[PDB]
């Protein structure tokens, strides 16, 4: 496979301000009506965040802009998206983005989510292709439009889908979805959340606490990555891809001391750097 579409432009990355955001739970010990302060990797408040354009329409007619770059992992990574239609599935996290290192491959054609830590060959323009199988008459997902080779694989796992819809809401939710990715001490851990947002794009003032999903015995350093996509095929109208619009939020983590104020219930609310 490795069918590639680059196009051209970057544009100045449209930035934003995470007000109170990215506050994951530091320990696995439940704390109610008590204050605990740790110094750990976080996304510091009111920091410089980068909101991205994935496949993007700036209207004249059409003009879908596929910009999503390979991005360094740096210290740690934060992620946020709305995507009432789901074009986003997983991320390519790795180092060489090639063989010679392992590869963290997450995808989501989801009765369920599925996770892969393997050695792949990722193409120049990787993303998950989706087509129509005409037998069972369903929509399959061609997964090798992302990567050519799958071999040597070190680890595999399956779980209930992290990405989840609700919809029926004609908006007013947008189903804002956040995922934090922190790679330490042999455990690369994933944190998820789902939140309604009525604002047009950017983030509210509310606090979002993400419980750890799975603590994975990984063992690789990931210095760079890119997201994944779900596109499809169309037929004769005046290759074919780019369902809907796609945009998301990315920011890098950083060690900071954040006092965590638990509620009577024990759910963290106020976090101060």
């Amino acid at each position, epitope marked *: 496979q490795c069918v590639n579409l680059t196009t051209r432009t970057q544009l100045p990355p449209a930035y934003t301000n995470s007000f109170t955001r990215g506050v994951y739970y530091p320990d696995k010990v439940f704390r109610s009506s008590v204050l605990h302060s740790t110094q750990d990797l976080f996304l510091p408040f009111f920091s410089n965040v980068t909101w991205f354009h994935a496949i993007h329409v700036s209207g004249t007619n059409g003009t879908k802009r596929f910009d999503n770059p390979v991005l360094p992992f740096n210290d740690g990574v934060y992620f946020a998206s709305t995507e009432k239609s789901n074009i986003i599935r997983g991320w390519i996290f790795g180092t060489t983005l090639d063989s010679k290192t392992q590869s963290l491959l997450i995808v989501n054609n989801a009765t369920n989510v599925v996770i892969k830590v393997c050695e792949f060959q990722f193409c120049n323009d990787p993303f998950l292709g989706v087509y129509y199988h*005409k*037998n069972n008459k369903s929509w399959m997902e061609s997964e090798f439009r992302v990567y050519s080779s799958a071999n040597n694989c070190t680890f595999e796992y399956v779980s209930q889908p992290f990405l989840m819809d609700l919809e029926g809401k004609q908006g007013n939710f947008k189903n804002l979805r956040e995922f934090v990715f922190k790679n330490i001490d042999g455990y690369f851990k994933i944190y998820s959340k789902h939140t309604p947002i009525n604002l047009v794009r950017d983030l509210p003032q509310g606090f979002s606490a993400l419980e750890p999903l799975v603590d994975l015995p990984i063992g690789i350093n990931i210095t760079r990555f890119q997201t994944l996509l779900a596109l499809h*095929r169309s037929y*004769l109208t005046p290759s074919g891809w780019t369902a809907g619009a796609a945009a998301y939020y990315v920011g890098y983590l950083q060690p900071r001391t954040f006092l965590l104020k638990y509620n009577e219930n024990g759910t963290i609310t106020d976090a101060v750097d």
Partner: antibody
Amino acid sequence: EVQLLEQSGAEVKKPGASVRVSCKVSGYTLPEVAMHWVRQAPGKGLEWMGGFDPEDGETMYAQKFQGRVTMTEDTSTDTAYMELSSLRSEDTAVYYCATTTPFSSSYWFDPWGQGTLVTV
Amino acid sequence: SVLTQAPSVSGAPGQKVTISCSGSSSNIGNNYVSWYQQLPGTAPKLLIYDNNKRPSGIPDRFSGSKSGTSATLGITGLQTGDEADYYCGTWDSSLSAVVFGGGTKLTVL
């Protein structure tokens, strides 16, 4: 968008034979889109043949020619074999590989296969 | 085959004249119509689909209409390279299949 592979090649089979027709594609995958077939006799018109049905999900067979010609599909190698049997007088002709949308409800045969004559 | 159109038609270059195909309610009545072009010993090319829609690469000078069981293929701005046969087709539920007419070979005079 898409260019296709040829329908057959040059297949010349003397009377007392039968011939498969393997039409491959490029730029798509085989079972995202439905194939079709049309008899075209030189100096003559179109006679539709084979074909897939968007409704009911079956692969159609032209009633007039039904049972004489069959079709199979290999999804990964994109090979769709059209086997016509029991050669007769007027049945040597160009038989076009054609396609309609997998989404269905489309009658138009779309980019097609350049044509291949057969032999009786 | 089961449809109605003439073997050939002729007209002077650069003029405006169309070609029609007469079906029935069992074929054209409830179904969408297509039109095709082939040069001698060549690949028959889709002309217009649903009679109102142009495939990619078709001159806008072509139009179409469906009046009852009658479907006309709009042909305008005749060219020296426009001489070829045009074929009408529409879905058939009678034999539950695809049908065509005998074809009409245009001639640009």
